[PDB]
Write a protein that binds this DNA or RNA. Structure first.
Lengths: 49, 195, 56, 138, 73, 123, 176
RNA sequence: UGGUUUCUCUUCAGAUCGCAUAAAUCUUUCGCCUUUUACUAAAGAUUUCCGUGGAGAGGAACAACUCUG
RNA sequence: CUCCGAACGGUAAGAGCCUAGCAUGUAGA
């Protein structure tokens, strides 16, 4: 879903402050969503690796 | 089995049970104590050892993280001069210390994590904690905390050494951490679990 | 494990083997927990004299 | 004990100094008495008994003997030598040897009456050696 | 400098920042400065592993955020 | 060592008698220090004699938070012992303050779904 | 077995006589090897037998709270609660240096304020030495006058907290 | 005409009743959000608590000092 | 530039034996 959006909006996604705010909120939400499926204790600092 | 699981983690909790299915982790500690005793008995004449007389222990000794009793001890013959306490890699050892006659070696495996790969620092930490303020059954003058990390496959030791035992235990730990009959069963369980 | 004589049981702990002998159902009329203090001047001072005489 | 005023008490206080000190030392020794021996409310009985004798000494020196001055009388009631309510109940002719001020309270009894402390023996029953549990005596 | 969070039971959870080469005796003095007890009567524990009184924090590999279960002796 | 033990017992009892004598003299020295400081402000010197310094038990060595480092307090529970573990100048990046927090796009205060407070401390 | 060795004899200054030490120290001392061999039976004459055999003055030691027999005999004496004549007999007896030190701990904990200054004052003239278990378990030499002055010092004894009714200066204005 | 005080109990308070100022609830809003409570504060009105104001009732202290007129 | 968070979502699951800090204050003959 991201490769379909970033390639079609190659110059547009860099020159839109509201579009970058949606990406930083969604990517932090999915890393929150995938971490709950592993354990459900709300971890403090999950490793990005 | 001694594997510390921090969170709930319902996926990886059962997978560690599937690896440590039967009494295999306790059989690792029995295999290392038998393998190091066989290397000590094969060179007991030149090392001035009287009799390798490794006594029995509690069957859940490796499970208990608090106490650390003498597992594989070695009676020296006579005029045995102990050395300064150092790690298993410090080549600048000094034998200017007290002279004892009874000497032990306590092996304690520890399944480490990402923030516990300092197996050399962990070996001196477990020895100095279990030396004076231990409240555990151990002989007084000297010991050896020959630790073996199960996760990172790291081998390290710390404590007061014996003359001629520092190249002896280093050559024995290479044949104990590699090609062991228990560690080969451990590596076969992980590779079958991950395919 | 241990072996209780009067209680007729078998415990594994050291304090539990002592507690099964004294402090059980069979230990009701066999030295119960209700103790008694001795004389402060007669029985107490004679024990200090007997300890000094046996040592010296 | 601290006088808690530090305001230079007048003449006559030195005349009543060792007498009030002996009564204050008796109440402090009674307050340090353990709870053994007393059943449920018998331990509070020497607390009111030392307080009853402390109020009787000031009232006899002011009303009966009239030897203490009124300035030393007001300083004694303010420092805590005697309760002002206990001297007020003794001023009336109906009560001159009352046991305690708790026994004169009408709302204290469950039946809504006085205690056995404020009752004469001639108007009472024949066989009665009872003592007031709240007050302390008859 | 690691921020060890001595999080015991029943609300007693404080942050204690100590050096890596700092001994455990210096850590109990900093843990008592945020909790309100005598530092000689505090025994740190991690699944029945009572820590010593002479081993540095760099030997236990206690990194930043490694919380401890505090107990009182 | 019977004669040596009687000398040390006389040494400790003389210091204990000196400790009890200085204990009652501590109340006299407290009123004397109040009398000396009152005369020092009155008719000693008009801002020409201070005769003291800045004697504080624990050191006030501090630093500066980089951009969003947490307000880590030392804890106001033991301030009279003056131990060496306290004077350490707690202004170090502990866990998450090691980043510069300026290259980051708009703001990252706490990414743990609990940002009740909405502040940056400039107003 | 561990509540109180007397049913109803007396009471401590502010609580039960068994709850005079700290609850964290009393729970670890209740489960001990020296305690379980002693709490099954202990009398007045038996208290003089066990106290004379031990020569140590200290409290807890080690990682886990391991109580010394000096603190173990102090709790067994406080649970038994003997008479004041037996406690004065253990303080005046010169049969052992640890015997007078064991009576002084029971005097400063449960005794009165005037009785504590009256009994501990002749103990300050003793110049003998004793062995004390430190925090790391090693033995340390302590004089008899050093331990007696520590009981009259601030409340920092090994698992003991019981202030007096006043200091030595405030008691001097009232009595000797 | 005739009483300075103090403590109990009966109403309404539309006066900065409070020259100062807490919590909870309800109806709408924002931010985080991952289950929920503890959350952030903008609007309005409903309680609880910290308190108070005039006017009759009953006790105690010199009510007698004689207050205003 | 100094705005500092707490709990739940978490340790299992069972077999035989062993010991404990607790509570009520009755009418009746």
């Amino acid at each position: 879903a991201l490769i379909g959006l970033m390639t079609y909006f190659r110059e547009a996604v860099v020159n839109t402050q509201e579009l970058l705010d949606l990406l930083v909120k969604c990517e932090n939400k999915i890393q929150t969503r995938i971490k709950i499926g592993l354990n459900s204790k709300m971890p403090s600092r999950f490793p990005p690796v | 089995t001694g594997i510390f699981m921090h969170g709930k983690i319902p996926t990886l909790k059962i997978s560690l049970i599937q690896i440590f299915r039967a009494h295999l982790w306790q059989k690792i500690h029995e295999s290392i104590v038998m393998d190091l005793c066989q290397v000590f008995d094969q060179e007991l004449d030149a090392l001035e050892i009287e009799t390798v007389q490794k006594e029995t222990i509690h069957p859940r000794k490796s499970y208990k993280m608090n106490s650390s009793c003498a597992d594989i001890l070695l009676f020296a013959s006579y005029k045995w001069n102990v050395s300064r306490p150092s790690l298993l890699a410090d080549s600048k050892d000094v034998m200017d210390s007290t002279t004892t006659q009874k000497y032990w070696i306590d092996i304690q495996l520890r399944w480490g994590d990402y923030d516990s790969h300092d197996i050399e620092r962990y070996a001196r930490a477990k020895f100095l904690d279990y030396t004076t303020d231990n409240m555990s059954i151990y002989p007084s003058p000297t010991g050896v905390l020959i630790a073996i990390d199960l996760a990172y496959n790291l081998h390290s030791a710390y404590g007061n050494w014996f003359p001629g035992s520092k190249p002896l235990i280093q050559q024995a730990m290479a044949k104990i951490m590699k090609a062991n009959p228990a560690l080969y069963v451990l590596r076969e369980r992980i590779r079958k679990g991950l395919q | 494990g241990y072996y209780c004589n009067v209680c007729d049981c078998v415990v594994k702990d050291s304090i539990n083997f002592l507690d099964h002998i004294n402090g059980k159902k069979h230990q009701r009329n066999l030295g119960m927990s209700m103790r008694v203090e001795r004389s402060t001047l007669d029985q107490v001072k004679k024990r200090f004299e007997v300890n000094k005489k046996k040592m010296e | 004990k601290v006088k808690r005023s530090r305001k230079a008490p007048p003449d006559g206080w030195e005349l009543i100094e060792p007498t009030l000190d002996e009564l204050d030392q008796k109440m402090r020794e009674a307050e340090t008495e353990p709870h053994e021996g007393k059943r449920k409310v018998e331990s509070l009985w020497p607390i009111f008994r030392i307080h009853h004798q402390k109020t009787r000494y000031i009232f006899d020196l002011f009303y009966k003997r009239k030897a203490i001055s009124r300035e030393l009388y007001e300083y004694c009631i303010k420092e805590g030598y005697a309760d002002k309510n206990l001297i007020a109940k003794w001023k009336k002719q109906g009560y001159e040897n009352l046991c305690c001020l708790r026994c004169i309270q009408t709302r204290d009894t469950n039946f809504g009456t006085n205690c056995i402390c404020r009752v004469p023996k001639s108007k009472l029953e024949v066989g009665r050696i009872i003592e007031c549990t709240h007050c302390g005596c008859r | 400098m690691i921020e060890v969070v001595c999080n015991d039971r029943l609300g007693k959870k404080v942050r204690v920042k100590c050096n890596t080469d700092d001994t455990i005796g210096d850590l109990k003095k900093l843990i008592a400065a945020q909790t309100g007890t005598r530092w000689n009567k505090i025994v740190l524990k991690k699944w029945y592993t009572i820590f010593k009184d002479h081993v540095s924090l760099g030997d236990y590999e206690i990194h930043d955020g490694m919380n401890l279960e505090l107990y009182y002796q | 060592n019977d004669e040596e033990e009687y000398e040390a017992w006389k040494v400790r009892e003389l210091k204990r008698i000196k400790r009890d004598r200085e204990d009652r003299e501590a109340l006299e020295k407290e009123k004397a220090e109040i009398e000396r400081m009152r005369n020092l402000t009155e008719e000693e010197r008009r801002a020409e004699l201070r005769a003291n310094g800045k004697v504080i038990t624990n050191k006030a060595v501090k630093g500066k938070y980089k951009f969003l480092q947490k307000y880590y307090h030392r804890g106001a529970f033991f301030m009279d012992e003056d131990e060496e573990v306290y004077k350490r100048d707690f202004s170090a990046p502990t866990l998450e303050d090691h980043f510069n927090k300026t290259i980051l796009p708009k703001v990252m205060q706490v990414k743990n779904f609990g940002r009740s407070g909405r502040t940056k401390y400039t107003h | 077995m561990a509540n109180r060795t007397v049913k109803d004899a007396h009471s401590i200054h502010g609580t039960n006589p068994q709850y005079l030490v700290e609850k964290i120290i009393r729970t670890r001392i209740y489960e001990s090897k020296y305690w379980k061999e002693e709490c099954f039976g202990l009398t007045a004459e038996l208290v003089v037998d066990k106290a004379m055999e031990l020569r140590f003055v200290g409290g807890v030691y080690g990682g886990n709270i391991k109580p010394t027999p000096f603190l173990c005999l102090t709790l067994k004496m406080l649970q038994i609660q003997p008479e004041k004549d037996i406690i004065v007999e253990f303080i005046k007896n010169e049969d052992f240096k640890y015997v007078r030190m064991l009576g002084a701990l029971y005097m400063r904990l449960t005794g009165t304020a005037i009785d504590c200054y009256k009994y501990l004052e002749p103990l300050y003239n003793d110049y003998r030495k004793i062995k004390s278990q430190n925090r790391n378990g090693e033995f340390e030499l302590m004089h008899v006058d050093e331990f007696i002055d520590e009981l009259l010092h601030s409340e920092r004894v090994c698992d003991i907290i019981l202030p007096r009714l006043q200091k030595r200066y405030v008691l001097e204005e009232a009595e000797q």
